[PDB]
Design a binder for this molecule. Structure first.
Ligand code: 2D5
Ligand code: 2D5
Lengths: 255, 264
């Protein structure tokens, strides 16, 4: 099913206008970047190693993260996404243009940083791009190039999007939780009350979750929820590429 | 007056794109190095406008050339902007940019960096859009004339504020000429009005393609005395010393000054 997933279609649907229009601050893109930026600016999420779970073809979710972790592992289930990443990490031709997201991240963080430096830094600190399957109790396998356990995890729009129901969502969460050291941090972004989205020829089933469900799922996996918030999807961002109602952002800490 | 006939003649070889490349592309156009001159200039303008002490309806940019960066912070504070230059080829380059033509020089790195410094979370596309909207006219100017815009000028006079970057010292064969050109533009500004003046220190030449232009070297002391003689109180006068890495053979500039002055 994910076997028909078109990276460029997905990027077009979610990271080009209107949803990728970062000029309005009331949009979902600026909201997400702000969540991430505010969270790292507290100083409490730090360490040497970080893993991004189910990164798809996207990088925005590490823009703020990358100044606090010197070893970054990105991951996805699909080769075609791994290679779309690689195209961007290696500044190859036909890479997706993330420059506006980098620019807005610089603007939000407020340190005077130029966006080319931020990209440079992200590209430098991402050492590897590995396969992953969160449906496995060892999402990475055993012969894993990745430093384990990790100091922090980031995951945006993966678990709900690869899980037919709540229970599989819970298990997938337990599975990635093993990659993270005790005391470590999980940064989790996702769709609320969504049941499908499109990516070219692919129509993906999603489990609709509520904020309450996400919270309880986090507790039951062994986390303290340091923060959990919601963005309600305005009407002009309801575009026929999915049925998302809102987006959640969770900051959680392993006990 | 002979001196200014030489200036006019010399400018007839002025090539915008060469001038842009020399001064507003890398390494001088490198906005990543905060210790660079581009950021220093944007910071001077941002910090001055962020006091709120400089505001009004009308602003005039004196000797804009083919450049736009010097209005990026200002345009949030003035609803009517006049841009000006001696050369048609520069005025046309402005035209291209006003029309959002591809093939126009790209000021997006400057617009972004200005957005970054001002700290209001503005995106650069909106900044540019606002600038294009607030620029109400692009006019011939000659600062050596007692009426630099001419007699029945379109321009709303007197203006609430003037900006001038790298003009007066670049078109004046000597200090006395510099002084008079200053007095001339000062007639365009209302009393109580503000002048933001950026310029080269101790430079005697720069290159604009074919053209190698003679300019009067001035010091900070000279700039300050001239402002005083023209009837200004100096609120701020800052100096940037050009690092060796930015001394590239496009001019013999030693530093840059930023002056904020208010007309008595
Ligand atoms: N078994 C698996 N293990 C790990 N990862 C897997 C996997 N199967 C598929 N994946 C990957 O998960 C990524 C999911 S991309 C996320 C799509 C979520 N769908 C949406 O409709 C969101 C996306 C979105 C994004 C930004 C702002 C708003 C919205 C609205 N809702 C893809 O790259 C797969 O290869
Ligand atoms: N008679 C006249 N009245 C008014 N404007 C006139 C004029 N004759 C010529 N102009 C215009 O003056 C402008 C002068 S622009 C160039 C002068 C700059 N010299 C420099 O050396 C560098 C130096 C520098 C250094 C660091 C960062 C930026 C810069 C920018 N300029 C041109 O557009 C003329 O058409």
């Amino acid at each position: 099913a994910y076997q028909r997933f078109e990276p460029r279609a997905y990027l077009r649907n979610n990271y080009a206008p209107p949803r990728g229009d970062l000029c309005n601050p009331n949009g979902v893109g600026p909201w997400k970047l702000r969540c991430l930026a505010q969270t790292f600016a507290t100083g409490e999420v730090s360490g040497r190693t970080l893993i991004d779970i189910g990164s798809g073809p996207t990088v925005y979710q590490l823009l703020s993260a990358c100044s606090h972790f010197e070893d970054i592992t990105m991951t996805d289930f699909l080769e075609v996404n791994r290679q779309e990443l690689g195209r961007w990490l290696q500044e190859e031709p036909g890479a997706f243009n993330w420059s506006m997201y980098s620019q807005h991240a610089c603007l939000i963080e407020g340190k005077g940083e130029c966006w080319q430096d931020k990209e440079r830094q992200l590209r430098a600190r991402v050492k590897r791009v590995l396969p992953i399957d969160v449906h496995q109790p060892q999402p990475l396998g055993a012969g894993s190039p990745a430093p384990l356990p990790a100091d922090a995890l980031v995951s945006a729009f993966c678990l709900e999007a690869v899980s037919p129901d709540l229970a599989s969502f819970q298990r997938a969460l337990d599975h990635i939780t093993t990659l993270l050291r005790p005391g470590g941090h999980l940064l989790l972004i996702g769709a609320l009350e969504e049941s499908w989205y499109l990516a070219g020829e692919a129509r993906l089933t999603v489990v609709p979750v509520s904020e309450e469900e996400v919270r309880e799922a986090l507790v039951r996996s062994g986390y303290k929820v340091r923060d959990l918030r919601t963005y309600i999807m305005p009407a002009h961002l309801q575009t026929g590429v999915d049925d998302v109602k809102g987006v959640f952002f969770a900051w959680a800490q392993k006990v």
